[PDB]
Amino acid sequence: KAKELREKSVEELNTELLNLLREQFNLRMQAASGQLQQSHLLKQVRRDVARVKTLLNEKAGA
Amino acid sequence: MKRTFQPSVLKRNRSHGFRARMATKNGRQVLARRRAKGRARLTVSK
Amino acid sequence: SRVCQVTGKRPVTGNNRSHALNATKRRFLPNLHSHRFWVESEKRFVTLRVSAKGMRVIDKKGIDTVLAELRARGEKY
């Protein structure tokens, strides 16, 4: 997804990151209960977040 | 019968703990030696 | 530390030999002395822990020169 997310603004990125974080939180909440029967999702979300962070760093002073 | 070891944590730490070891040159040397050996517990420190 | 500031004379080790040649370790300390030296240029006394040899050297050369040398060496006075 990085090539797609690279074509964005800083503000845009930040919002996306926030959203991702929220999603992750939700997953965690679900995971703890017996709701989440799709574990890979959590793995994905974290990765996405990381990618976003990396992108942000690249943008701001690199 | 009052046996020799009469534990006290603070006393132990002050005596033998990491910071004490650091404080002196000989202590430092000891630490270094331990490291070289491969000790898991470098000091008395928990 | 017993070190002439002008000359650099430290203590050196050696032996006491007895009449039966019994070596025993000893030191040879330098003949140090703290002496106020008048510095004519700056118009003040500079105290220096110096050997008698150091003093002699100073006399020979001029205190100023000695001071300069010391400075060059990175030594406070």
């Binding site: 990151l17 926030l18 974080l21 929220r22 992750q24 939180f25 965690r28 909440m29 995971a31 703890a32 209960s33 | - | -």
Partner: protein, 94 residues
């Protein structure tokens, strides 16, 4: 003022147990697993934002990890922070 991002990270899970259940039912108090670094205020903030529910007070405690033995090898479970969060009267939590 706690950062949104920080808040999201704070709260680890709901804690299911008899005691917890009792707390929920009788005293209107939810029992959460939270980050070990998460202070009380932060936790409260997280609760308010992320569950949308007024908080009366948060009590925290640190649970020490049990030492176990997997076959011959000894090994310790992690410490973790439990939080009893008391919700205001009439606050029903999903």
């Amino acid at each position: 003022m706690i950062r949104e991002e920080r808040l999201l990270k704070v709260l680890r899970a709901p804690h299911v147990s008899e005691k917890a259940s009792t707390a929920m039912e009788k005293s209107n108090t939810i029992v959460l697993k939270v980050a070990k670094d998460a202070t009380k205020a932060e936790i409260k903030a997280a609760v308010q934002k992320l569950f949308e529910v007024e908080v009366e007070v948060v009590n925290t405690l640190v649970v020490k990890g049990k030492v176990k033995r997997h076959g011959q090898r000894i090994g310790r479970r992690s410490d973790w922070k439990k939080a009893y969060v008391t919700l205001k009267e009439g606050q029903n939590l999903d």
